[PDB]
């Protein structure tokens, strides 16, 4: 009967003046072991305020080698605060993608790869243009990020999917250890009047 | 030269890793129109181009790149368009009958993007120029003119399939590093810091390649009120992440490295599948196998460096 929670996260979403279709957050922290806990609740937020994909990423891959664990922490809080759970967990697979550095630059050549083999089974000629790219990619079916949110002292993307970030809205935050709705939610309202 | 302040910081600032090469979005010369028409703030900006270039230059900075026009900027007022074609032949037609001038410090110009897009004489000028201020080897200064990196890699891109189309490299070949060698920026190493003025905060399709760790410097000045201390602040930012980007870096580095090098390790036991042999070691089948593939791909993808070398070269003439 938390029916109220999902009101309340829905009225702040159709609140702003533009919610991301596609978000991104980075996580450049370093100085210890991130807590999936955190970035559990980060995840979940953005579902019910309605953002649809949401990637995270690290660039030492410590999020793809613990994919279990961490999509295990999105559904446990989902199932805690949210509250038939093949489908909610299909959602979450969907819409959750779980990156590193070999998704962005490394997927870049593997799609090169392609078009190069194609054209050694002389299927293919180079005469490759600029959205024949961006089919190529994994990014094949799902958009690019519209906001990614960088949580940590490092300011890079440290190999962010470079493709795809093209227009996109960096906001930076200090940490993502112990991080409150009401912090996320500012990063949404500085999204929504960001010239977009 | 420098104030007595801007040189005192520099010293003392030169004390740490400094570095080699900074980029520059030029951004918010509309915003600046404030009793300015349009067009006179843009030729504004342009002089804070040249202030800002003694300053790294004082800096050592010794490679610089800038956002001069984006593919994206084609749908502007073509009363904007068009004056902004003026003062690229204005400053292009400096850059000669100032010849020699220029050869007396060491400075060479790269103009970096798709130049088919420009008015004939532009690409004679920008053409002319590169051609003559090439083989200069003390400082660099690569302008971007119609330049969007997502053009850019989906030229690389395909200029690597005219290799293998070519019979020079095959696609086992392609890797990071040789679409790495076939941008437009090829020449430069890959930047230290990205610097973008005004209040915006995105890379709008600016060298994410070559800037994928390097230090994003974002900054709430318009562009032509630019100072030698928002310079100096970013270099600050800059040498604060030094010693995690370049950790960063380095551990990137080695992964892929060593990726590359299971991969390799792989199909060649791929083929040892087939054919019967075994994957033993003993009298270093895998081992000899592996190291002609290495050679193989060295040889094969240098040659076809040297050839697209060769084939940019030929467009320089006319």
Not at chain 1, 5 to 21: I, N, Q
Not at chain 2, 135 to 158: G, M, Q
Request: with cysteine; proline share 3%.
């Amino acid at each position: 009967a938390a029916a109220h929670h999902r009101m309340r996260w829905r009225a702040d979403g159709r609140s702003l003046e533009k919610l991301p279709v596609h978000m991104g957050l980075v996580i450049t922290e370093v100085e210890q072991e991130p807590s999936f806990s955190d970035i559990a609740s980060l995840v979940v937020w953005c579902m019910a305020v309605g953002i649809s994909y949401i990637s995270v990423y690290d660039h030492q891959g410590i999020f793809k080698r613990n994919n279990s664990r961490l999509m295990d922490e999105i559904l446990k809080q989902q199932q805690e605060l949210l509250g038939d759970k093949d489908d909610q967990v299909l959602n979450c697979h969907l819409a959750v993608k779980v990156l590193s550095p070999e998704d962005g630059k490394a997927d870049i050549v593997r799609a090169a790869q392609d078009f190069c083999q194609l054209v050694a089974q002389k299927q293919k000629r180079p005469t490759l243009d600029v959205d024949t790219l961006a089919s190529l990619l994994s990014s094949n079916g799902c958009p690019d990020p519209d906001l990614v949110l960088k949580f940590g002292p490092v300011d890079s993307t440290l190999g962010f999917l470079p493709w795809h970030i093209r227009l996109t809205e960096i906001v930076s935050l200090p940490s993502h250890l112990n991080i409150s709705y009401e912090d996320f939610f500012s990063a949404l309202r500085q999204y929504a009047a960001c010239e977009q | 030269e420098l104030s007595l302040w801007e040189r005192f910081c520099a010293n003392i600032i030169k004390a740490g890793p400094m570095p080699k090469h900074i980029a520059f979005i030029m951004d918010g010369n509309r915003r600046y129109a404030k009793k300015c028409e349009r067009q006179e703030g843009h030729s504004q900006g342009f002089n804070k181009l040249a202030e800002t270039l003694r300053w790294c230059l004082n800096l050592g900075i010794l490679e610089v790149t800038v956002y001069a026009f984006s593919i994206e900027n084609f749908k502007r007022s073509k009363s904007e368009v068009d004056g902004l074609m003026d003062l690229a032949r204005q400053k292009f037609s400096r850059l000669m009958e100032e010849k020699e001038k220029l050869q007396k410090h060491g400075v060479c110009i790269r103009v970096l993007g798709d130049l088919h897009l420009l008015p004939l004489d532009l690409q004679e000028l920008i053409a002319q120029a590169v051609q003559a201020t090439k083989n200069y080897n003390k400082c660099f200064l690569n302008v971007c003119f119609a330049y969007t990196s997502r053009h850019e890699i989906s030229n690389a891109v395909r200029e690597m399939a005219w290799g293998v189309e070519q019979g020079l490299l095959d696609p086992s070949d392609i890797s990071e590093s040789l679409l790495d060698k076939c941008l437009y920026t090829n020449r430069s190493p890959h930047p230290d810091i990205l610097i973008r003025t005004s209040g915006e905060v995105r890379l709008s399709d600016f060298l994410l390649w070559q800037t994928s760790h390097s230090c994003l410097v974002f900054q709430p000045v318009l562009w032509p009120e630019y100072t030698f201390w928002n310079l100096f602040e970013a270099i600050l930012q800059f040498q604060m992440n030094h010693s995690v980007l370049q950790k960063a870096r380095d551990m990137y580095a080695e992964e892929r490295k060593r990726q590359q090098l299971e991969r390799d390790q792989a199909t060649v036991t791929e083929q040892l599948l087939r054919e019967g042999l075994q994957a033993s070691g003993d009298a270093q089948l895998r081992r000899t196998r592996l190291h002609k593939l290495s050679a193989r791909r060295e040889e094969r993808v240098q040659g076809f460096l040297q050839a697209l070398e060769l084939k940019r070269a030929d467009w320089l003439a006319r």
